[PDB]
Amino acid sequence: SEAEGRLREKLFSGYDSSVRPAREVGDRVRVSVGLILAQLISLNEKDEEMSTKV
Amino acid sequence: LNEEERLIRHLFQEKGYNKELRPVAHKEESVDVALALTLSNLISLKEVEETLTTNVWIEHGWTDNRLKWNAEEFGNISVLRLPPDMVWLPEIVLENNNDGSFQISYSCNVLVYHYGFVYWLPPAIFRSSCPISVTYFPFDWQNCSLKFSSLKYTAKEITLSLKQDAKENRTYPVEWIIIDPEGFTENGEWEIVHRPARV
Amino acid sequence: SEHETRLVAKLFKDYSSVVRPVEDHRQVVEVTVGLQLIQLINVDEVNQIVTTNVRLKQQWVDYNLKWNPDDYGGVKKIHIPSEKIWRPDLVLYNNADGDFAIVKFTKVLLQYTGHITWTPPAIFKSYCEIIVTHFPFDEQNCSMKLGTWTYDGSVVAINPESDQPDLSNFMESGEWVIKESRGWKHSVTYSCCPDTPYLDITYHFVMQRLPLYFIVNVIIPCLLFSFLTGLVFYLPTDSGEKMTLSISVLLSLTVFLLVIVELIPSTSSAVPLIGKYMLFTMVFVIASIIITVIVINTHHRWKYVAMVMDHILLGVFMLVCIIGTLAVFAGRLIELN
Amino acid sequence: DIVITQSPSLLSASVGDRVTLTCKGSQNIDNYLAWYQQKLGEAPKLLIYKTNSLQTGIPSRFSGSGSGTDYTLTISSLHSEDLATYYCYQYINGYTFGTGTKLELKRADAAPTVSIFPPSTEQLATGGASVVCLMNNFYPRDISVKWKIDGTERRDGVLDSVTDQDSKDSTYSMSSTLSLTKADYESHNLYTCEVVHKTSSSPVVKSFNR
Amino acid sequence: IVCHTTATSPISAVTCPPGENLCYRKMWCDAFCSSRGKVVELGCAATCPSKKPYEEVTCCSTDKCNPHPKQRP
Ligand SMILES: *[C@@H]1O[C@H](CO)[C@@H](O[C@@H]2O[C@H](CO)[C@@H](O[C@@H]3O[C@H](CO[C@H]4O[C@H](CO[C@H]5O[C@H](CO)[C@@H](O)[C@H](O)[C@@H]5O)[C@@H](O)[C@H](O[C@H]5O[C@H](CO)[C@@H](O)[C@H](O)[C@@H]5O[C@H]5O[C@H](CO)[C@@H](O)[C@H](O)[C@@H]5O)[C@@H]4O)[C@@H](O)[C@H](O[C@H]4O[C@H](CO)[C@@H](O)[C@H](O)[C@@H]4O)[C@@H]3O)[C@H](O)[C@H]2NC(C)=O)[C@H](O)[C@H]1NC(C)=O
Ligand SMILES: *[C@@H]1O[C@H](CO)[C@@H](O)[C@H](O)[C@H]1NC(C)=O
Ligand SMILES: [Cu+2]
């Protein structure tokens, strides 16, 4: 995949995964959070603990 | 000099093999991955935890044209054994696992044949979620399943299919779980009645 | 003071752990495999799993790891991380639910001849067909089928170090005695391939259970309950204790069943001999209760007839108890004897 | 370490002949054997390494073979440039060398020109009395020399040297000497040099008196 | 009689022991039948070997009459 390889190499030139993508210093990164419940594995009333696969 | 060393330098360093990229000519193509499952042992079914523990060997097969060679040019090497970390993998996981162990247990070598076929037979211990039906207990029967899919690739990037066997030069799909007719030690409490497979 | 660093650098500058360590690819790597059994950790009859502590000694010659000792001050051996070098991928074929391969990557000992010794520790959970019929006096033949997973016999050959596993360091078990052990190499042919054999080494151990624990905790209570169920017939009807006695014995047996079901394996593959004896005791108690009810009703109707029936049934019950106990235990004791 | 022996110690051969040299270890050398060629006054040149691999630029005449403890070097067709000493050595456990094989040109047999010379009076005036015996242009190099004085054999003070094959005729020339004091010389009068060589069933003798 | 045998590696043609007169070939599937094909066992027998339910046995009285499935007599 020549074009995908070249684009992938382009994007990560000088990229730093440890630095959040705020363009200006005061900018905030908006993150949307959603949840899909695949399985309610269990609820334990002795440990007061709910186990879920999501 | 060892012909295997020359061939591996050829395939990976000289041709610049990138394991990150799918083995396709064009991005719009999907790689056909064929699966078969060998059940080595049915370890246990726990009804209280509703968990099925199985020992399985997941026979992957796919074609990677980047890994072709002419055997006569490399001392009649027809098969090559490689760490799975070297080659591109379709990254199949047990989707309905019960404990967060999505991936295969033992990363054994892949066998790459000179005509470009990549064959893999990773063994794995799986703990899948099998919802129990208690109605007729103890004379009950349970419909457990193992569901395999890729989370890294969608149906547009790789195609799942069942392995095809052949008899009298006529092919047919292997639509069932493989079990050794003589080596298979049966479980102490459960008997396998049917073992179908579906895409 | 610096020559060992030089040696390791010279060895691994151009090393490859992917290719087989032979001069010519048509050659076979000869691996010597020696299983040392350190401890029989556990046996599980319910899940048919044998857990053992082992050292899996592997010896082979790496063609590329030779050196001349005089170039390095007489250094004849070094220690190398095993992740650096090529290794045979021995897999426990009959793994139950443990690791298929080695996961403790200890160091190898490398000699100037290129000879590598690697002795990784492992915990093996092998699948074993437990036979429960003679339980608890049973002998189990349990096996460990080891072989290269991906290499076939034409590229890697494995040879057993000795006819038997190494038991010199074996810690004695508290419940099983290893009667004998033996490794056999097998070569198998398949219809794909007339030329290439597939090789495995199957070690096996014949372990004999020590029955004393199960004799104490299971056999004696059942014997006592049977004895009481026999004695209940010598008790007079006019005592009124008959029904109370039989009911109390039934309740005690039912309570002890909560122990029995914990101790007896739940495998439905076959009925354990101790389980058969338990069921026999249960049926005997039930029949004794039924017969006691019949005799009580007879006496209230005939008194001498009921007494003669009691005297006959006392002997019948005690003879059935002794006969059942002997038919259960004597056969297995004679087989072991 | 591995001890190495070579055979033959000398090998007479003619131009164009195939020739084979054998090297044998006390232990398995595991094909880690090399062969190098040396001429007089010349830097040694490696011919073969790892029992088979020709050194780059070596003529195809040379080929190596062998296994275990026994190895051979073969020259298919001996050129005149190939007359030399050949050493095998191993490099797997220590470094040890053979004694060398002196591959030399075949030559027609020649009887030695034997002669004897007393210590001249110019020497006797100094007190030295070395007698000398010469054997010129003999072949093969197998030769034995004995000094006898008044019929009694002498070994004390005896020395000898032999030239290499002559560049034009390939024969050998040998000298031998017997150092004596003036008193020891004057104590005897008969002197003879006896030469044993393969070209005759009986030794040649050359003698002098007074 | 001379029959093929798998007791040696590779498969070899061997004169049978005295008294035994039938070549035989037995095959069955194992845990690797899906990729390696059937197991193949070749040998000599006086009587044709019994069949387990999953086994396939063929017995014959000719020299080298039980080749490997990829070979020919
Ligand atoms: C506990 O359970 C374990 C289960 O793990 C039990 O283990 C079993 O124990 C048995 C003995 O107690 C073993 O049987 C013996 O196995 C030997 C190894 O067999 C293999 O190798 C043979 C070649 O090896 C020779 O050469 C090597 C090279 O150095 C030597 O090291 C060896 O010692 C040998 O000299 C090879 O021929 C065998 O393959 C043949 O048999 C198998 C079936 O077993 C076939 O599938 C093969 O195709 C092949 O068959 C050929 O040969 C037979 C004749 O043998 C012909 O009839 C066929 O047609 C065909 O030509 C194996 O790969 C054997 O050497 C040994 O042979 C003895 O007995 C036979 C008769 O039975 C005689 O003919 C021989 O002369 C000799 O006396 C014997 O079979 C099991 O292998 C072993 N099994 C396992 C799975 O581990 C253990 O006993 C139990 N213990 C208890 C209950 O206490
Ligand atoms: C490969 O196989 C062919 C056919 O058997 C043989 O002639 C040839 O020498 C082998 N070797 C190489 C290096 O091709
Ligand atoms: Cu040092």
Side-chain angles (χ1 to χ4, degrees), chain C residues 141 143 180 184-187 202 204 206, chain E residues 5-7 24 28 40-44:
Chain C
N141 180 346
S143 65
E180 67 182 342
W184 289 106
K185 181 182 175 181
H186 304 108
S187 59
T202 300
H204 72 259
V206 181
Chain E
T5 184
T6 52
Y24 76 96
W28 65 102
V40 184
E41 175 178 330
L42 303 170
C44 297

Side-chain angles (χ1 to χ4, degrees), chain A residues 1 3-5 7-8 13-14 18-20 22 26-27 29-30 35-36 38 40-43 48-49:
Chain A
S1 193
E4 188 193 346
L7 175 59
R8 189 183 294 264
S13 183
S18 68
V19 179
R20 74 180 178 99
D27 288 341
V29 182
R30 297 178 65 185
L35 195 68
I36 304 109
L40 170 58
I41 298 173
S42 64
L43 189 156
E48 294 206 302
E49 184 183 72

Side-chain angles (χ1 to χ4, degrees), chain D residues 31-80 82-152 154 157-158 161-167 169-181 183:
Chain D
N31 290 100
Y32 285 101
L33 193 92
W35 291 91
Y36 77 80
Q37 179 192 76
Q38 181 174 34
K39 296 174 178 177
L40 298 177
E42 284 282 9
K45 188 181 298 291
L46 186 76
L47 302 176
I48 297 292
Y49 65 98
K50 200 72 189 304
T51 316
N52 302 316
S53 305
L54 273 67
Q55 175 71 316
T56 300
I58 290 300
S60 308
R61 302 194 292 279
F62 301 101
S63 62
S65 75
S67 61
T69 60
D70 298 77
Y71 302 86
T72 70
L73 169 68
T74 297
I75 314 179
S76 65
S77 179
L78 184 69
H79 284 37
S80 59
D82 307 342
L83 300 172
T85 308
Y86 293 81
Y87 292 88
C88 59
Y89 71 90
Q90 54 96 8
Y91 51 92
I92 186 49
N93 191 20
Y95 302 90
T96 55
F97 298 76
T99 60
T101 296
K102 189 153 173 74
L103 177 58
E104 197 68 16
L105 190 60
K106 191 67 144 290
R107 172 57 164 86
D109 304 342
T113 293
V114 187
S115 57
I116 189 174
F117 310 86
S120 49
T121 59
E122 293 77 12
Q123 192 190 157
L124 295 173
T126 70
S130 304
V131 198
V132 54
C133 175
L134 307 181
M135 290 129 288
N136 300 3
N137 303 304
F138 63 100
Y139 184 92
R141 209 177 64 85
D142 298 337
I143 190 166
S144 296
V145 183
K146 180 170 294 189
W147 285 98
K148 271 170 171 271
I149 61 103
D150 289 358
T152 69
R154 180 67 75 102
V158 176
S161 71
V162 191
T163 63
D164 304 283
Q165 275 207 344
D166 181 279
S167 308
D169 63 49
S170 281
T171 65
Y172 303 96
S173 291
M174 173 176 190
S175 70
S176 63
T177 59
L178 167 55
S179 60
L180 303 170
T181 63

